[PDB]
Design a binder for this molecule. Structure first.
Ligand SMILES: CC(=O)N[C@@H]1[C@@H](O)[C@H](O[C@@H]2O[C@H](CO)[C@@H](O[C@@H]3O[C@H](CO)[C@@H](O[C@@H]4O[C@H](CO)[C@@H](O)[C@H](O)[C@H]4NC(C)=O)[C@H](O)[C@H]3NC(C)=O)[C@H](O)[C@H]2NC(C)=O)[C@@H](CO)O[C@H]1O
Ligand SMILES: [Ca+2]
Length: 273
């Protein structure tokens, strides 16, 4: 088979030494890499920029003519990644090399057979500040029809977090938008937790971390991302080969999803970044 799907809740990706490189989510589709040796026990695969090996035990072969395989498609304005059969995200502007409504396939979302994608927000250094002011960030809620968000009118807190921790506020808004449904998930509302941060406050089971109010949620999560990711050499969103996506999320397209929200916000606010 050319394509395999991840069966367990997560599965590891290994190098040729058997060292763990990363982990990917249930349902993720990986490509067989025909330039490297596979055997009965491990397949040479590629996913989201990462070339490595996976245990056959963790995979199911697909038939691309009846099973969903992720693909990319242009509507003539933007290029969309179908990350699931019923869900697409805009990743880039249309290029004249793209045929409208043709499905295109890629192991990294940058290299295609007839064109090359720039995904600049996917690789942007997150320690550089956004050119958007607090008042401009606050406008995004009306421009994208985001109702009932706990992050409404918190642009000033995102820009404070950026000033103090040296982390891009557009990234902070986009990450909280993707991770918490714009501060509307149950964990956002219960716990002012907009970035998916977990903690054992000694409390036996792993749970979402509690923050005392919306502002302390934004500032506290920024501190946690600075200390756990930025300060440890994860300084861009990236994919399964490099950046925050290697460790932050099993979803191979978490970084692409956040970059897509940054692209949409930047377009709505006049393209200053
Ligand atoms: C098509 C589209 O745009 N879909 C959107 C959804 O993606 C989105 O729902 C959110 O989806 C993300 C994944 O993209 C999901 O992220 C989970 O976040 C947790 C952290 O809270 C990660 O936990 C990691 O677990 C591993 C162990 O497996 C740990 O080692 C690691 O330390 C953990 N990370 C941290 C920081 O603690 C999960 O791996 C990760 N899950 C996946 C599958 O990647 C969010 O939880 C989703 N949020 C929801 C559902 O509210 C949705 C909502 O905005 O919008 C869709 O549009
Ligand atoms: Ca190694």
């Amino acid at each position: 088979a050319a394509y395999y799907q991840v069966v367990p809740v997560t599965a590891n990706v290994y190098d040729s030494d058997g060292e763990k490189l990363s982990y990917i989510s249930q349902g993720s589709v990986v490509w067989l890499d025909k330039d490297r040796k596979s055997d009965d026990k491990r397949l040479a695969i590629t996913i989201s920029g990462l070339s490595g090996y996976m245990k056959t035990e963790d995979l199911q072969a697909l038939d691309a003519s009846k099973d969903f395989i992720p693909y990319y498609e242009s509507d003539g304005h933007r290029f969309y990644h179908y990350v699931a059969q019923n869900a697409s995200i805009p990743v880039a502007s249309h290029l004249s090399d793209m045929e409208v409504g043709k499905k295109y396939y890629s192991a990294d979302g940058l290299h295609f057979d007839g064109f090359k994608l720039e995904n600049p927000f996917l690789f942007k250094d997150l320690t550089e500040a956004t050119n958007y002011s607090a008042e401009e960030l606050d406008k995004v809620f009306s421009l994208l029809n985001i109702n009932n968000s706990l992050l409404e009118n918190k642009g000033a807190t995102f820009k404070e977090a950026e000033e103090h921790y040296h982390i891009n506020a557009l990234y902070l808004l986009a990450h909280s938008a993707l991770e918490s449904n714009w501060g509307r998930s149950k964990i956002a509302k219960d716990k002012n937790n907009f970035f998916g941060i977990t903690a054992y406050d000694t409390t036996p089971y792993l749970s979402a971390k509690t923050f005392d109010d919306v502002d302390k949620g934004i500032l506290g999560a920024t501190k946690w991302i600075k200390e756990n990711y930025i300060d440890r050499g994860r300084t861009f969103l990236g994919n399964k080969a490099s950046g925050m996506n290697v460790e932050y999320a099993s979803d191979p397209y978490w970084g692409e999803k956040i970059a897509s929200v940054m692209m949409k916000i930047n377009e709505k606010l006049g393209g200053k970044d």
